[PDB]
């Protein structure tokens, strides 16, 4: 049964009201997709509202990509979305995590010049 793929896809597309309706009907927020990726991992990092709704319903912020070991905070930092990064950190997203190539969230942010994010992460440390 495919409500796990419907929740991940809606999160990936930033479709807040579709995520909300799926969660309300009992779609499990920590169910992985075909690539073993959870909604919080595949979500449109531009949508802090999707992130908060996932977390309100019990999504875990620290789940790692089973290959890359990228966490949600790595992608939020790499794409420069401070709002989503704050929501994730507030919920318990560890900022001291390294991906497969030994990069921290603050590394991804600095390398691309996402200064609002890099400053937030340097201060939170």
């Amino acid at each position: 049964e495919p409500s796990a793929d419907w929740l991940a896809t809606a999160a990936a597309r930033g479709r807040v009201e579709e995520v909300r309706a799926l969660l309300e009907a009992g779609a499990l927020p920590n169910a992985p997709n075909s690539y073993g990726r959870r909604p919080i991992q595949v979500m449109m990092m531009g949508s802090a509202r999707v992130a908060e709704l996932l977390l309100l319903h019990g999504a875990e912020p620290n789940c790692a990509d089973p290959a890359t070991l990228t966490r949600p905070v790595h992608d939020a930092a790499r794409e420069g979305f401070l709002d989503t990064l704050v929501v994730l950190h507030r919920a318990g997203a560890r900022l001291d995590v390294r991906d497969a190539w030994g990069r921290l969230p603050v590394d991804l942010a600095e390398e691309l010049g996402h200064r609002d994010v890099a400053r937030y992460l340097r201060a939170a440390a």
Partner: nanobody
Amino acid sequence: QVQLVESGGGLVQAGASLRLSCAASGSTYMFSISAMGWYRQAPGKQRELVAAITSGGGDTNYADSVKGRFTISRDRAKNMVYLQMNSLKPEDTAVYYCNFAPGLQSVRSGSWGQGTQVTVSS
């Protein structure tokens, strides 16, 4: 604002168990989306984070000194954070505080409740 009230402490002998409760009221919204932790301040020592838990309740961080003796948990529906304290040692003697724990690490805040005194005698 979030109002946190702490209970469960008092006097035990070494080897004993306690269960601390932190109950949230007010912006229980803010509480439900927030990582929470149990902090302790021993006499003559700096306040330290001993246990932290994600919003979701399924992911935890512990100080190595309490890891495996203390379990943090939460009841998302009741707006509660618990610390089950097993195998208590005299060095666990402290005032225990619940607060936010962003990133499962220590908050920087001037907003603390009264805490709950835990005294472990030999």
